[PDB]
Amino acid sequence: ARKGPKRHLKRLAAPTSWYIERKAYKWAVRPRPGPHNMRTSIPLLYIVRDYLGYAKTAREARKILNEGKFLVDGRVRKDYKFPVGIMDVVSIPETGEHYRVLPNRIGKLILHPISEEEANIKPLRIRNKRMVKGAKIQLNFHDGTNHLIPLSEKDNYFTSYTVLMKVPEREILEVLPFEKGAYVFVTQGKNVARKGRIVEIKKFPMGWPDVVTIEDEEGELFDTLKEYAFVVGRDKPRISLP
Amino acid sequence: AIWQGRSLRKPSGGRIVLARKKRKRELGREPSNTRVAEQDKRKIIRTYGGNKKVRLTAAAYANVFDKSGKGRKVRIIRVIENPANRQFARRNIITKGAIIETEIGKAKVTSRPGQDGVVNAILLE
Amino acid sequence: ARGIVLEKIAVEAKQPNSGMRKAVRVQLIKNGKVVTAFCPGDGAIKFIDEHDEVIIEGIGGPKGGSMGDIPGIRYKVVKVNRVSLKELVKGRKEKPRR
Amino acid sequence: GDPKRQRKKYETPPHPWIKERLDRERVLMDKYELKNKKELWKHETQLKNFRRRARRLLAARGKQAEIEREQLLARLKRLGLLPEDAVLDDVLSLTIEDILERRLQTIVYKKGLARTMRQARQLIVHGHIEVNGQIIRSPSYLVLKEEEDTITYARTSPFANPQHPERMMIEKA
RNA sequence: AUUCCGGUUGAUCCUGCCGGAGGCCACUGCUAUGGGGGUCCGACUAAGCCAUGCGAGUCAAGGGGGCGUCCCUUCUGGGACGCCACCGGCGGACGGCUCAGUAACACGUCGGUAACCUACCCUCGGGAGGGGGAUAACCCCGGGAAACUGGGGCUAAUCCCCCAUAGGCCUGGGGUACUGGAAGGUCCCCAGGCCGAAAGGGAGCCGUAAGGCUCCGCCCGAGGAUGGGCCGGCGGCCGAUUAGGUAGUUGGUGGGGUAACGGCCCACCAAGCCGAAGAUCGGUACGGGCCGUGAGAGCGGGAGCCCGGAGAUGGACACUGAGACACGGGUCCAGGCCCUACGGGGCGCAGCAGGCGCGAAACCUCCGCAAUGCGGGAAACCGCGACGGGGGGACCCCCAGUGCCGUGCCUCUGGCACGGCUUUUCCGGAGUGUAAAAAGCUCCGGGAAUAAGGGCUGGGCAAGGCCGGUGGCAGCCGCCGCGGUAAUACCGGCGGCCCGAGUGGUGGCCACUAUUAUUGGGCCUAAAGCGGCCGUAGCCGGGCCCGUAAGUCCCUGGCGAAAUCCCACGGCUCAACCGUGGG
RNA sequence: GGUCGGGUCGAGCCUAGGCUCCGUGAGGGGGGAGAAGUCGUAACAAGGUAGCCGUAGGGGAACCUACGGCUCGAUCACCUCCU
RNA sequence: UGGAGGUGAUUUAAAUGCCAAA
Ligand SMILES: [Mg+2]
Ligand SMILES: [Mg+2]
Ligand SMILES: [Mg+2]
Ligand SMILES: [Mg+2]
Ligand SMILES: [Mg+2]
Ligand SMILES: [Mg+2]
Ligand SMILES: [Mg+2]
Ligand SMILES: [Mg+2]
Ligand SMILES: [Mg+2]
Ligand SMILES: [Mg+2]
Ligand SMILES: [Mg+2]
Ligand SMILES: [Mg+2]
Ligand SMILES: [Mg+2]
Ligand SMILES: [Mg+2]
Ligand SMILES: [Mg+2]
Ligand SMILES: [Mg+2]
Ligand SMILES: [Mg+2]
Ligand SMILES: [Mg+2]
Ligand SMILES: [Mg+2]
Ligand SMILES: [Mg+2]
Ligand SMILES: [Mg+2]
Ligand SMILES: [Mg+2]
Ligand SMILES: [Mg+2]
Ligand SMILES: [Mg+2]
Ligand SMILES: [Mg+2]
């Protein structure tokens, strides 16, 4: 990148969370800017071709996508560079199957089958919260999307809470607070994909991130970063997890 | 032309051999010496990222504010003094922090005319 | 290295050996310096003519220098007019351009 | 830095002319009918590697060490080099002859499919021997214990007929 | 394999260096049957110079034209269909090549930006009102040796320009709604100014028409994402026969400039800043992941694949754009070269092939967009010397061949004579394979038929006390040493030994070497204790009690890309190679 | 876009001075090999004047002499100090 | 028995190594 942005991506330099063969070819698909970041998303082409196996070559994968056979969060996606990330819902209505994208026990993305009824809701972590013109509150979620609420409910939402959103209408139906006893699922780090209940919260001076302690089903305690803990229920999960 | 990249001298006094050509994003521009004149004169500069700056070269009016929060548009007579440079007052150069005299008294400039395109001052009691 | 032959000489062995070792003076193409090169083999000097071009390499003594009873000679002849000298000594081949 | 360069899989002797080593290796070469010394050396290296793994794991402790120890034992007794009740110490008593007995050429000779080692090598190279329904033409392939008994003449070979003149000569031994 | 062997004497024991014996890399002599896999092949001298062909396009669903074929009527026309250039949009700043410069915030690693920019993409909240204008294409006339280029006429747009509104920025006075560890930040209300949007456009159906209903689109605000800019602490070469260096230099105050902080640049006020724990200067080099060697501690290198930096004949400087001071875009100087009708006009392969030169030192002026990706398009698609496929080459690694069996004879290892067998390999066919081919793989016919060399032969060091030449001559010899007419050492014959599709020569690095010694060496007589003493920094420092927790030890969060290394299992016949897991 | 004026930056070019590198070079100087053209016998035994270190003077050449020092000096007689 | 020091002295002149070993 001597004079401008990069447009290519070698196979050997691909993100380490993909299921891909790094020596079979030279190039890989450089993902388009979109909802999630690089470390927690994968292009749609690899889901269509390599994961599910509905296509053998890239050319016939693009023909499937252009016909609108794939839904991501209830919206038709035609771009083969579109990034798909954590907690998303992939629906194929013609075959009537649904999946949720989740990290593995070693940090790789996998598709977890879910029921049709559960496919209508998506959990969103409140990543930031700000005031906006006209004196309204804007919520910024972990996947980059935004929502607006009036000044009256400013005390019902804080950062690290989880909102259950009905897609594609984008209508709020539940708020899950972040506190002791809440049920959480870990998304990054050494303890990725472990789940449990919150026990303690600690804070540090001068901008160092804060840490939480979690107890699992077997009764073991482990620590992780607060921002890596994803609230999924009050005392039981509200969604299916592997 | 005007290059603002780095110094060619180490803090210990040793010299530095330049290791690359000058990048376009490191260049400066000619200073705008805002004079006092009968009529105002300004231009528009296209800047990095395709943005814009309004550069004022000649000034005739000013906005003067009082401690009560009210402002009036009055014209400039002359520059009494300017701590920035020793000979700006003689040449009637207006910069931030200069003292000017208007039809309603002395005032001190609070804006940057070369960056904003307007002259704002607070009234001196 | 590659060079051009200037003249033929002979060097006496050191004590207590006796004999004459046949060598040539070679001017190097790459920088113009003049060195001395030994011609290995029985009667090998008869295949060398003045103004021929030769390929020389190290003679293989201790510390990358001279060997045996002929100090002062650090190189030996390998090719003559792009033909291996060892073949010419054994036969199996004829020196080109007469 | 530098990219990967593929390396030799065998080691050469530290000194090329030692009388005792020459005699021992000549005896082995004559007995097992190998083509050249390097082939023999290849097998030697294999043996050494096993020993070097046993020595390192004896002086180790932890969680990964136990996994590697059991993996080494399982691999060694899968090849048929150790009995089913062997322990780690028994690794240090293997010899070069133990590995040479596992070559496909030797096993073909011992099973009675051939009269001589050289005939066994020729039979393997020309493609008359099938192992578990597959034709293999490498005389140095090491045979696993689980597949040793399923070694026969290829079902398409001329030798897969008891009336063949050459097979009857083999059976005569 | 955590190793020794030869050399100083008439004989002995030491110190000490030289040589042998091992691995890897570059060049090279002689000699060569086959297949597979891989990140190999003008890097070292010349980042020297280059003939010819190619290496970046795409959009007809943005807009007016030209030409052709048909249908309806047609004087005239209107349609439909297909090609062509032009205006217009996006891209051409990525990809590809090389290592000259650079000892530096260039690179590795942990952090920061509350001091910043970002076209394409995602979510939410809003908007699209009213006018104006030229010109290419096309027609008439041209100029010039050419490169290029003039005048007049006529026309459209998602082309260009105005007005309004929304919106943006600066400063002064209040209120305390948000995030955060902490507000020169965000939100609300007054006040003075300056800047200042848009294309309801295109396509298809239902529409008699009216108008819907989808598809692609245009503008503003808030946030994200992607790609970057800038800053800090720590870490990694050699020289004292280089000891003092610096004067916008170091800091402060007031400004300018920038996307943004900053002596980045000015005006004024001070005398600071670096240094024997090595400043300054000189030498040599792109940095890292890694690679070679060794029991390890270490020592040496960092061309090929990935990540970061820099460059486009040398030295300077700008236009457009979201992004450049731009390898196949522009200007000047310097230095080469080419075409001219002599007035002028052009060109630098460190892109793929190919040529000259320099050298010890390095390949075809080939086929394809079928796969992997990128740019363009609503899409089908089009282009791509990237990438993929072959051609030449003792580049590296893995698996094989040059026959096998039985009975006799011999000098019994090995050769010969009879009888039999097989076809890896070889010759000729069918299928499969491939973008098309070629290899490869499965079958069919013939037949032991088509296939062994290089070095050594006195000791070190495995192998002849045999024959013929030469006669201190010729020659050999890493080292020790042979040759003076009865040579196991030179030349040749016949034997023999080592490795084997390879085997020898020359140069370099590691080991050998405890001849660089932390582990782990020496200084009476062998190299080596200053002629003697006093003392500054540094290093090393007596016993007990109380406190602290910097060093040190244990547990646990966030990091140190992938490739490369080790192990088990799985896929190509096994392997080399590749995939899933654990380290 | 042309012409003039002003300010500022600036590759290159010329002159002078000072350091530094490469190629030749009359003449001078020791060093290393060779084998003997030459004059002597200085080091080894008490080497025929014991050898050697420091400083100074002299001589064809190894070398000689003076003052202070060492044993890495042979023989005889006497004396002294020890085991 | 074997050692370490000190003081005295110490009668003319007397150079060289060819041929060979080869
Ligand atoms: Mg490198
Ligand atoms: Mg001696
Ligand atoms: Mg070149
Ligand atoms: Mg570029
Ligand atoms: Mg360089
Ligand atoms: Mg306007
Ligand atoms: Mg380096
Ligand atoms: Mg290269
Ligand atoms: Mg070429
Ligand atoms: Mg080569
Ligand atoms: Mg012989
Ligand atoms: Mg022997
Ligand atoms: Mg040595
Ligand atoms: Mg020593
Ligand atoms: Mg002393
Ligand atoms: Mg002394
Ligand atoms: Mg103490
Ligand atoms: Mg501590
Ligand atoms: Mg890694
Ligand atoms: Mg298999
Ligand atoms: Mg396997
Ligand atoms: Mg792999
Ligand atoms: Mg004398
Ligand atoms: Mg004397
Ligand atoms: Mg005298």
State the ligand closest to the CA atom of A22.
22
Residue type, C24: V
How far is the C-alpha of C38 from the C-alpha of C23, rounded, in Å?
4
CB of A56 within 8 A of CB of A50? no
Q: For chain A, how big is the Rg over CA atoms in Å?
A: 19
Cα(C46)–Cα(C56) distance, rounded to whole angstroms? Answer: 17
- For residues B41-77, b (16+ Cβ closer than 10 Å) or e, as one string? eeeeeeeeeeeeeebbbbbeebbbeeeeeeeeebebe
CA atoms within 13 A on the CB side of A230: 28
Q: Among residues A184, A177, A167, which one has the least CA distance to residue A229?
A: A184
Q: Are A164 and A174 in contact (CB under 8 A)?
A: yes
Within a domain: D168: yes
**Alpha helices (H) along chain D:** 19-32, 37-58, 63-78, 96-100, 104-110, 117-126, 165-171
Structure tokens at C82: 């792009």
Tell me the CA end-to-end span of chain D in Å, nearest whole number. Answer: 61
**DSSP 3-state assignment of D74?**
helix
Q: A203-235 as b/e, with b when 16 or more CB fall inside 10 Å?
A: eeeeeeeebbbbeeeeeeeeebebbbbbbbbee
Ligand 6 centroid to residue B44 C-alpha, Å: 15
Nucleotides of E under 7 A from a protein CB: 1, 3, 18-19, 21-25, 28-30, 37, 39, 92-95, 101-106, 112-113, 117-125, 169-173, 177-182, 185-188, 190-196, 221-229, 231, 245-250, 254-268, 273-274, 279-281, 288-292, 301-302, 304-312, 316-318, 320-327, 358-360, 370-375, 378-381, 386-388, 396-406, 420-424, 442-443, 461-463, 472-479, 481-484, 490-492, 497-501, 505-508, 556-559, 561-565, 567-569, 573-574, 576-583
Rounded to the nearest 10 degrees, the angle between the axes of helix D19-32 and helix D37-58 is: 110
Please give the structure tokens belonging to residue A110.
Answer: 């996998």
Q: What 3 state SS string does B53-101 have?
A: EEEEEEECEEEEECCCCCEEEEEEEEEEECCCCCCHHHHCEECCCCEEE
Give, for A231, the enclosing helix (H) or strand (E): strand A229-233
Report the C-alpha gap between D40 and B103 in whole angstroms. 109
β-strand partners of A185? A195, A230
Is residue A27 within 8 A of residue A11, CB to CB? The reply is yes
Given a contact cutoff of 8 angstroms between Cβ atoms, the answer to whether D117 and D109 are in contact is yes
Q: Are A240 and A118 in contact (CB under 8 A)?
A: yes
Contacts of A197 by beta carbon, 8 Å cutoff, 6+ apart: A181, A182, A183, A184, A214, A215, A235
CA torsion A231-A233-A236-A241 (nearest 10°) is: -60
Q: Which long-range contacts (CB under 8 A, 24 or more apart) does B60-64 make?
A: B60/B36, B61/B119, B62/B100, B62/B102, B62/B107, B62/B109, B62/B119, B62/B120, B62/B121, B63/B118, B63/B119, B63/B120, B63/B121, B64/B102, B64/B104, B64/B107, B64/B121, B64/B122, B64/B123
Other CB atoms within a 10 A radius of the CB of residue A124 amount to: 21
Q: For residues B88, B90, B96 and B101, what is the CA-based torsion angle, rounded to 10 degrees?
A: 170
Residue with CA nearest F7 C1'? B30
Identify the DSSP state of A193: T
Nucleotide nearest to D4 (CA to C1'): E564
Give the integer Cα–Cα distance in Å for A241 and A230. Answer: 12
Strand F: residues with CB below 7 A: B 1; C 14-15
CA–chain centroid gap for C72, Å, is 13
Closest alpha carbon to C1' of E475, residue: C42
**How far, in Å, is the CA of B5 from the C1' of nucleotide E333?**
26
What's the CA D144/C1' G4 distance, rounded, in angstroms? 87
Strands A195-202 and A89-92: unpaired
Q: Residue A157 and residue D5: Cα distance in Å, rounded? A: 59
The structure tokens 């003689």 sit at B90
Q: Of the candidates A78, A77, A80, A13, which has an alpha carbon nearest to the alpha carbon of residue A42?
A: A80
Identify nearest nucleotide to residue C16 by CA to C1′ distance: E472
B71 contacts: CB under 8 Å, gap ≥ 6: B63, B64, B65
Q: Give the span between the Cα atoms of D73 and A214, in whole angstroms.
A: 40
Q: Reduced to 3 states, what is the DSSP secondary structure of residue A163? A: strand
Q: Which ligand is nearest to the CA of D141?
A: 21
Residue A80, SS3?
Answer: coil
CA of A241 to C1' of E359 (A): 70
Q: How far is the CA of D156 from the centre of ligand 14 (A)?
A: 74
Beta bridge partners, C21, equal: C11
Q: Tell me how far the alpha carbon of residue C8 lies from the centroid of ligand 16, in angstroms.
A: 57
Residue D150 sits in which domain range? 16-173
Judge contact between A148 and A137, C-beta under 8 A.
yes
Q: What's the CA–C1' distance between D53 and E37, in Å?
A: 28
Q: Three-class SS of residue B27?
A: strand
- Going by the DSSP 8-state scheme, the letter that residue D150 receives in this structure is S
Residues whose CB is less than 8 angstroms from the CB of residue A50 and which lie 6 or more positions away in sequence, other chains included: A19, A20
Backbone φ/ψ region at C43: left (φ over 0), alpha (ψ -120 to 50), beta: left
Rounded Cα distance between B117 and B111, Å, is: 9
Beta-carbon contacts of B65 under 8 Å, excluding residues fewer than 6 positions away, are B71, B120, B121, B122, B123
Q: What is the nearest nucleotide to C12, using C1' and CA?
A: F34
Cα–Cα distance, A184 to A192 (Å, whole number):
11
b/e burial code for range B13-27 (CB count within 10 A of at least 16 → b): eeeeeeeeeeeeeee
Instruction: Name the closest nucleotide to C72, judged by C1' and CA.
Output: F33
Instruction: Transcribe chain C into DSSP letters.
Output: -EEEEEEEEEEEPPTT---EEEEEEEEETTT--EEEEE--STTGGGG--TT-EEEEEE---GGGS--TT-TT--EEEEEETTEEHHHHHH-SS--S--
Domain assignment present for D86: yes
Q: Please give the angle made by the CA atoms of D123, D128 and D132, to the nearest 5 degrees.
A: 120
The tokens for A163 are 């909102």
- CA neighbor of A123 nearest in space, from A7, A231, A5: A231
Domain boundaries, chain A: 1-119, 120-178, 179-242
Bridge partners (DSSP) listed for residue B122? B65, B108
Phi and psi torsions of C42, nearest 5°: -90, 115
Write down which chains contact chain A via at least 3 CB pairs under 8 A.
none
Rounded to whole angstroms, the Cα distance separating D100 from D135 reads 21
Strands A146-149 and A136-141, by their bridges, are: antiparallel
Q: Are B30 and B2 in contact (CB under 8 A)?
A: yes
Single-letter residue type at D26:
R
- Measured CA to CA in angstroms, residue A86 lies from A164, B10, D76 at distances of 14, 49, 44
Q: Are A192 and A105 in contact (CB under 8 A)?
A: yes
Give one DSSP letter per residue of A87-151, joined into a string.
T-EEEETTTTEEEEEEE-SSS-EEEEE--TGGGGEEEEEEEEEEEETTTEEEEEETTS-EEEE-G
Tell me whether strands C75-80 and C34-38 are parallel, antiparallel or unpaired.
parallel
* Integer Cα distance of A234 and B13 in angstroms: 65
The first and second tokens of residue A41, run together, are: 């998303």
